[PDB]
């Protein structure tokens, strides 16, 4: 974990513009390229702060770039407010991470009135900090983000957001499904666009476990991971759950996409040795099912519940496929 995975888990990652909660044209980690009603406008501005012609569309490298001129921003107006540079200049580096979270939400000015939480901050009384950071508009309006910076001010530790991670795979766990669908569907609501899920469940898994144990099947999900890491985009969020099943959530892309997307996944499965380096024969299929918002659906819940049952219906019809939910 770190300040670009913290602002990934609290922001989203894009790398086409889309619109934030106000309307504005946004992009890479929270980067607000301006508040004109204009796209052009917006386009012109990107075009400018990559220093390329984009139409629109970054790459990963870019945006990370863009996020830490951000976060230099950040830093160098922390350090220029009478009010927030010495609890800046006296704090640790995770609890300094914390204090730019608040800056990119927020802004400075924002955050220099939390006079009663900065005064905490500044005497290293962290619970009565913590304390006071939740009597805000900020957190009522906000209640997810701000209890994890909160609890990042409070331990000096990256624990609320580690708590997000698959410890096994390194991907995103169960928890972060509901805040990345969440905000996801919300984008593509103000923006007129498509999310779309796929569920994918490893076809007897079961039997990699008997045939050669379970620590080289958990190796066979990591690498797993890996592997779907590699089918999909940067902006794509991939999710283990549990045991040999995964989730695939599709941003910037439509229902051509979405089937593109699972049968390539489906394909490099079934076509990859699982632990070859390590002198290994592996072979698997999985069967996946996917959902298209707000094609198939206009509920969330829905949606993962048509991804589902799709997938299951693969398991029941022979495995090694893909079905788009009916
Ligand atoms: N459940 C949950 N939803 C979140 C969280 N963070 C952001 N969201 C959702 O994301 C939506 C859109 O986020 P923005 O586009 O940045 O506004 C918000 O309106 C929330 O509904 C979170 O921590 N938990
Ligand atoms: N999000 C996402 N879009 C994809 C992927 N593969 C293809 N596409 C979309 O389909 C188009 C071809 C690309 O320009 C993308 O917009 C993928 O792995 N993830
Ligand atoms: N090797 C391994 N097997 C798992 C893990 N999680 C779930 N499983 C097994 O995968 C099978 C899925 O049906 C079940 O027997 C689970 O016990 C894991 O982390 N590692
Ligand atoms: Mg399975």
Redesign the pocket.
């Known amino acids: 974990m770190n300040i670009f995975e913290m602002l990934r888990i609290d922001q989203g990652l894009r790398l086409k513009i889309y619109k934030d909660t106000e309307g504005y044209y946004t992009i890479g980690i929270g980067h607000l390229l301006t508040k004109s009603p204009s796209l052009n406008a917006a386009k012109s501005e990107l075009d400018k702060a990559i220093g390329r012609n984009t139409n629109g569309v970054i790459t990963k490298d870019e945006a990370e770039k863009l996020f830490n001129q951000d976060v230099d921003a950040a830093v160098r107006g922390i350090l220029r407010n009478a009010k927030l540079k010495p609890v800046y200049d006296s704090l640790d580096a995770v609890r300094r991470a914390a204090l730019i979270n608040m800056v990119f939400q927020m802004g400075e000015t924002g955050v220099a009135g939390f006079t009663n939480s900065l005064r905490m901050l500044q005497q290293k009384r962290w619970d009565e900090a913590a304390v006071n950071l939740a009597k805000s508009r900020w957190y009522n309006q906000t209640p997810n983000r701000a209890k994890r910076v909160i609890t990042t001010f409070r331990t000096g530790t990256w624990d609320a957001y580690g708590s997000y991670i698959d410890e096994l795979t390194g991907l995103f766990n169960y928890r972060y499904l509901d805040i990345s669908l969440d905000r996801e569907i919300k984008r593509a609501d103000r923006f007129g666009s498509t999310v779309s899920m796929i569920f994918i469940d490893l076809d007897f898994f079961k039997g990699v476990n008997d045939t050669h144990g379970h620590l080289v099947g958990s190796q066979v999900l990591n690498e797993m991971g890996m592997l779907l890491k590699k ?3 940067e ?2 969020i991939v999710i283990r759950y549990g045991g040999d099943e995964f989730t695939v959530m ?4 439509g229902e051509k ?1 979405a089937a ?2 699972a049968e390539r996944i489906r394909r490099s499965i079934e076509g990859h040795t699982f632990l070859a380096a390590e002198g290994f024969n592996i072979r698997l299929t999985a069967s996946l099912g996917y959902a298209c918002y707000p094609a198939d659906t206009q509920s969330k819940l829905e949606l993962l519940e048509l991804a589902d049952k799709a997938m299951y219906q693969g398991k029941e019809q022979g495995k090694n496929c893909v079905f788009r939910a009916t």
Do not use: P, Y
């Not at 599709?250 to 892309?253: F, G, I, N, R």
């Open positions: 089918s999909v985009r902006v794509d599709l941003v910037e892309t996409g593109t997307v």
